[PDB]
Design a protein around this ligand. Structure first.
Ligand SMILES: OC[C@H]1O[C@@H](SCCc2ccccc2)[C@H](O)[C@@H](O)[C@H]1O
Ligand SMILES: OC[C@H]1O[C@@H](SCCc2ccccc2)[C@H](O)[C@@H](O)[C@H]1O
Ligand SMILES: [Mg+2]
Ligand SMILES: [Mg+2]
Lengths: 1014, 598
């Protein structure tokens, strides 16, 4: 066993492992099978095991096979051993975590030795077959039972089963399992995720009788309009064939039996030598079946019984059946004859405390949040999931892409192993065992051959294998340029809507152009788009506009669902969120492990609301007084839907109402609004509509909002003058300062810097820092890309801004003058920002302080045409005071940016100061609100047309701090008020992705603010 | 080694075996490569070996690894041990010669223990890599060198190579080879022929330098009228890449150099991660090439040289190149743009004294008799042949169908193993290693996935693998009714000219009717017709009338070339011809082993 080194040989992937099959419980009662009750024949071995860690498999003492080591600890199974402190988890994206030298692995190969002592019932050993099932072990393992060697397995993400009938004794039995971190199977598992190890899914014992059901498959066929179905069930047995053996398949809808069939064994003739004596095929007719879809997940229950002709049951098995048909016809992917639009997301199995151990409670929480945010589909990135996941997607309704555990991203070239016939055996076990496990699940609609492994002849061979054994689902594969002969669907990753990226050999065309290339007929579904790393999803609306307009663009899967951060503890035992490199792991890919729409504890990022709104199932159009509502449901009528409408004048409600929705799938409804009020007061009128679900569902509460939209109606411009004040502000001119007094208010302008340096109400100072121009932001993850201090990427935005001096530029005063008018004081300033003799920006300002005590600020900025476009053009200061609440009239309530603001609505918003900070784990610019007309904070009020952010953290502190737990609140409050702000991008995060219409490239800018004390 | 029982496990088909590649001689001189002279770097180990027979592998004494058994005999290698009287040859057609219980084999498993003592030159051990090549061993074997275990192999009809660099010493060395009659590979080798065993093809040592040519492929493309060709050569190396390494490919017609090309290593970009640093592709233009066909077998000689930039040769390899194009267009199989008419025969490797040992003299005699009787094509029934066969078919002019060693005729139903994904590994080694060995031969015009194994998803997977790595030849397969999605050609066996035979699931239509079934567009070539058993071939004229009248009937392969009878001796020592059952073999299929035209 130490001399064969099976873990360094790609030709050996298992020894003594049993055939793959759909999930079995071996019920001995037909009613228990029908109702899905727990089976006495399936025991869990999850719980406390003994565990010892070793640096290599040669360091494991020989006594460990016979008895427990004294130095072993007690640990919970399932678990990852890096989550218990035995060695460090490693976060690496592309580079393999070991030397690339296939098929050898390091001689330092951390080894986990697990053991369990357990009782077996007397009844289990007299008759039948006892097997052990390991649902997942990472990465390869050898198994012993009572000191004797049983078998060996590889592939971390599919179950491994072994017959223990010959090894078990009555009384106390002992299992010993030796798990290796690295194996030749590690070469095929280079997914972008934490690299961990252990017995990380369930362990169980199953008892079957000697004559047994060994496999069964369920298939459904329809007539042209889905009014008649045939359920075809193939059953195979093992053991001794007898003439008295019979198989019955019955189909249940709730407690009503719908169809039934019975036959003896013996298939029809297949070839010159006969047929399968040990198989049978039943056909069951079903009239007007209820169809399964993500909108209405109607399920039936199929029970399969092996019994004698005189009626004695031997064993029963069962599964959930959904009647649906998936096909590609004339370049469109169809479900039940209608074209799908995929609102998809990629999801990893990740928990911040338990690593890669999934429980039911976590899975249900992810499914409810997905459906509540208008997702209908999920991609298993990038391996088969825990078996309970597919059951939940069947019951709640999500389309699943099921993916083989094959990724060789770090190879050079990427197809070095997948073009080699010596690795064809290892790859075929990963594809064929996934299909034999999952082919009965209705939620699985597409198979995938894996991810990022180039294009090799091995992929073509396996594409054709699946089409032949399971013709009822399309196959997709992205490697080798996303449109090879190994895919039914064009499935690019990160292709842009309008812009081509012409890389050699593997170009990423714009998605609209890809469709129409000479010869191309397939549908296009992006397997990854809109990389959600940090403050991201800019330009998301542009994908959804294209998906709705082009029939053959059928949607895509966002990258991705949840941040893969882990929890660490500081000195005081306070938890904090950690990422690549925080465990001493090296090399590592730092914060690239956090790409989620939700934080690792399942709290939402602000981008989640942008996804929910673009993916809505109702679309709205306004024409005069008429709202047109269009349904994008394919199958359901809107029977749980109420339309609420509200008209408001600059935040104040004027009229409201509700109307029930009655709209057929893909239909329209016209709603006529009552004669709207005509107010005399100035301001913009706004109409907001929202779709509300009055009743609770399996996945949502009563009152859930599923869709919304907002429009401008009539506007009345203000033609009244400000009330003529009696008091005149007084100007005092020293050598150092201009000082303006009016009543208890006082303003001070510094004549050497040319900035407002202080302001008094009574005797209380209002500023800690002067009001100054600001042209920079703390860089987002999309601004940095793959750039680092070792290896600078000169094309990233942060690198262009640094090389040009934007972070270092010094303001030089050109002019600072004051003048008394009739009723006001006017201050005029000009500044130039320079770096090594080059002028980057010029700003010219006027400040007008009138008798009402208002200060009107006008700003004019010029930007040199050859400097990189600036991140923002605005003012900043640090206010002296801290208030509890922020009140504003503008887009809200959540963080919104110029290329991510469709989901935000214009209204009067009011939040505690802490909701104005988004706590991204990697700190950056955050919390901006756009389209704002008025902002109130303490005694201050700003009016204008601006974007702002307000918080306790300076742009400087956000840029210098790598983790959110290291930030500290500064004295007072930092306010940033911008006339203009650049987009955030997010098509990908490793190349510039801010579209030309969101860059500040106009050269001249103007904005105005009024600062008063109300 | 006795506790792992690798010969009863379809997941293990080899241990420590090197990658498959085209034939190599490792010349150290470009002229010797061009003119095909014998290479000092390739030694034959054929001759006298020591041999002992045992009833099972558990009966082999442990001392046999270290030293010769006193009770061993001296025998010639290559040989079948049943031809020397150690146990009986078995003739069975369909029924497997062992209990059908995959993947187990009988505990009584006759075992042949071969050994050889040999000298290795001092120069071979200082530098480079020494490998041993076994061209064929039936059915599975373990190998030891100087007492230490080297490796394990299965598949009887393709070579097995092992690195011996770490095991050899200067002076006297000893090989020990333990050959098993039955293995899980026997389940895939149910061809209709005598069931024999032993080291039945050549054994050799090859010396390569550490930096070496590890593979090369040759492809030819034409303009619309075959007046201009491009020869494309892909070369791969192993060992340490250096900037000074260069590859030259040159093309010779007789003594005239016709084309030449030179490049450093480094392929073009393939994907997001780059290209192959250890490969290069040369393109050579050739104007008015002479085309290869069975009527005029014009050959060129391609020499591949690995050398330094300053001109020092490291190693040379060479092969014969024939310019021809094979394609299917509008339902016709075309060679050099013209539709073929196949005058074919099936041929087994059989000799009445030596069993399944083929020599050059026998091969040449069969080729001259075939051409003298107006045959132009030969089907390798039903496994890859001795490597010299394809060289002779290139030089004299015969079209070859090359066939994978896969036949599971005695299974019930016939696709029990070829529809199971647990046997997909074992089947893929039989197909992928044949293609990597033979893809440079001009005479090979069609690949075949094997014979009589029903139709399973494993056949579809392997059909698609060949179309992707070698698009220049059609693929055929007869199982599952001769017209499945795993064949480019409809290729029935024993379909009649005018009469239908409507069997359930797998009907044999008349060949004229098969052509015109709704939807059918492929050419039809019979992979077996006109069974020549005894006094036979009545109605042969009726096939040839139909072949000439219908364009899409493009001929067929007669079953078969030579009778598989063996020689026995009577009391007076007079030789006589024997058939199934004459060796006490039971059950047997009697005279069904004699189907030959000769
Ligand atoms: O979340 C990161 C993404 O990285 C890019 S590679 C290019 C970017 C990169 C490369 C190397 C290190 C870090 C990032 C992959 O294509 C995506 O599937 C996803 O894994
Ligand atoms: O030379 C015999 C031929 O037998 C028939 S099986 C049907 C005939 C048969 C079956 C069993 C025993 C003997 C003959 C095969 O299909 C041919 O390829 C060839 O091997
Ligand atoms: Mg990757
Ligand atoms: Mg046969």
């Amino acid at each position: 066993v130490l001399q064969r080194r099976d873990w360094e040989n790609p030709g050996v992937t298992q020894l003594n492992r049993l055939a793959a099959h759909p999930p079995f419980a071996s019920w001995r009662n037909s009613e228990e099978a029908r109702t899905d009750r727990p089976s006495q024949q399936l025991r869990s071995l999850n719980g406390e095991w003994r565990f010892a860690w070793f640096p290599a498999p040669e360091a494991v003492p020989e006594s460990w096979l016979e008895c427990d080591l004294p130095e072993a600890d007690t640990v919970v199974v399932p678990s990852n051993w890096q989550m218990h402190g035995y060695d460090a988890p490693i976060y690496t994206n592309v580079t393999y975590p070991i030397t690339v030298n296939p098929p050898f692995v390091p001689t330092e190969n951390p080894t986990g030795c697990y053991s369990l002592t357990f009782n077996v019932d007397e009844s289990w050993l007299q008759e039948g077959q006892t097997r052990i099932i390991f649902d997942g072990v990472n990465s390869a393992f050898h198994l012993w039972c009572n000191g004797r060697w049983v078998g060996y397995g590889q592939d971390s993400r599919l179950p491994s089963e072994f017959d223990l009938s010959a090894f078990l004794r009555a009384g106390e039995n002992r299992l010993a399992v030796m798990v290796l971190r690295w194996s030749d199977g590690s070469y095929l598992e280079d997914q972008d995720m934490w690299r961990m190890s252990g017995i990380f899914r369930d362990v169980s014992l199953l008892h079957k009788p000697t004559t047994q059901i060994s496999d069964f498959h369920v298939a459904t066929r329809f007539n042209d309009d889905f009014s008649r179905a045939v359920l075809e069930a193939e059953v195979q047995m093992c053991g001794e064939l007898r003439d008295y053996l019979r198989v019955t398949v019955s189909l249940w809808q709730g407690e009503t039996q719908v169809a039934s069939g019975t036959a003896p064994f013996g298939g029809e003739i297949i070839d010159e030598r006969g047929g399968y004596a040990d198989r049978v095929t039943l056909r069951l007719n079903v009239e007007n079946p209820k169809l399964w879809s993500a909108e209405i997940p109607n399920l039936y229950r199929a029970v399969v019984e092996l019994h004698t002709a005189d009626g004695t049951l031997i064993e029963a098995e069962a599964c959930d059946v959904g009647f649906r048909e998936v096909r590609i016809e004339n370049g469109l992917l169809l479900l039940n004859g209608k074209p799908l639009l995929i609102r998809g997301v990629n999801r990893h199995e990740h928990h911040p405390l338990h690593g890669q151990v999934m429980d039911e409670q976590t899975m249900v929480q992810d499914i409810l949040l997905m459906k509540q945010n208008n997702f209908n589909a999920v991609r298993c990135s990038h391996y088969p999931n825990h078996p309970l996941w597919y059951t939940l997607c069947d019951r709640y309704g999500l389309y699943v892409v099921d993916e083989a555990n094959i990724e060789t991203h770090g190879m050079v070239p990427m197809n070095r192993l997948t073009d080699d016939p010596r690795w064809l055996p290892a790859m075929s076990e990963r594809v064929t065992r996934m299909v034999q496990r999952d082919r009965n699940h209705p939620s699985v609609i597409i198979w995938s051959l894996g991810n990022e492994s180039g294009h090799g002849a091995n992929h073509d061979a396996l594409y054709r294998w699946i089409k032949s054994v399971d013709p009822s689902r399309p196959v997709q594969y992205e490697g080798g340029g996303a449109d090879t002969t190994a895919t039914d669907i064009i499935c690019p990753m990160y292709a842009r809507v309008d812009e081509d990226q012409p890389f050699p050999a593997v170009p990423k065309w714009s998605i609209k152009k890809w469709l129409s290339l000479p010869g191309e007929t397939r549908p296009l579904i992006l397997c990854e788009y809109a990389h959600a790393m940090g403050n991201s999803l800019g330009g998301f609306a542009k994908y959804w506009q294209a998906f709705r307009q082009y029939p053959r663009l059928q949607g895509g899967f966002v990258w991705d669902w949840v941040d893969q951060s882990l929890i660490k503890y500081d000195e005081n035992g306070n938890p904090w969120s950690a990422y690549g490199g925080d465990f001493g792991d090296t090399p590592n890919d730092r914060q690239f492990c956090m790409n989620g729409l939700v934080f690792a504890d399942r709290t939402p990022h602000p981008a989640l609301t942008e996804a929910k709104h673009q993916q809505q199932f109702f679309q709205f159009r306004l024409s005069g007084q008429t709202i047109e509502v269009t349904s994008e449901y394919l199958f359901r009528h809107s029977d749980n839907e109420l339309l609420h409408w509200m008209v408001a004048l600059d935040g104040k409600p004027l009229a409201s109402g509700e109307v029930p929705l009655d709209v057929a799938p893909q239909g329209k409804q016209l709603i006529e609004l009552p004669e709207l009020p005509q107010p005399e007061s100035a301001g913009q009128l706004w109409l907001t509509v929202r779709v509300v679900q009055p009743n609770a569902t399996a996945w949502s509460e009563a009152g859930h909002i599923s869709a919304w939209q907002q429009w401008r109606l009539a506007e009345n411009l203000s033609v009244t003058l400000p009330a003529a004040s009696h008091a005149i502000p007084h100007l005092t001119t020293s050598e150092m300062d201009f000082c303006i007094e009016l009543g208890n208010k006082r303003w001070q302008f510094n004549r050497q810097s040319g900035f407002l340096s202080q302001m008094w109400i009574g005797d209380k100072k209002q500023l800690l820092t002067p009001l100054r121009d600001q042209f920079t932001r703390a860089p987002l993850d999309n601004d940095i890309g793959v750039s680092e201090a070792t290896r600078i990427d000169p094309n990233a935005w942060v690198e262009r801004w640094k090389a040009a001096g934007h972070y270092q530029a010094e303001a030089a005063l050109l002019q600072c003058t004051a003048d008394t008018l009739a009723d006001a004081v006017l201050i005029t300033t000009a500044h130039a920002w320079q770096h090594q003799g080059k002028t980057l920006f010029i700003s010219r300002k006027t400040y007008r302080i009138d008798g009402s005590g208002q200060m009107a600020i006008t700003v004019d900025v010029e930007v040199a045409s050859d400097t990189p476009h600036p991140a923002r053009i605005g003012l900043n200061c640090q206010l002296a005071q801290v208030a509890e609440r922020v009140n504003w009239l503008g887009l809200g309530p959540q963080e919104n940016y110029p290329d991510r603001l469709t989901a935000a609505c214009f209204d009067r918003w009011d939040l505690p100061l802490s909701d104005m900070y988004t706590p991204y784990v990697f700190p950056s610019e955050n919390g901006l609100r756009c389209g704002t007309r008025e902002l109130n904070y303490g005694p201050h009020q700003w009016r204008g047309d601006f974007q702002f952010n307000i918080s306790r953290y300076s742009q400087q502190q956000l840029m210098e701090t790598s983790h959110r737990h290291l930030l500290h609140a500064e004295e007072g409050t930092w306010l940033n008020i911008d006339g203009f702000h650049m987009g955030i991008g997010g098509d990908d995060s490793w190349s510039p992705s801010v579209s030309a219409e969101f860059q500040l490239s106009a050269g001249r800018y103007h904005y105005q603010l009024v600062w008063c004390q109300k």
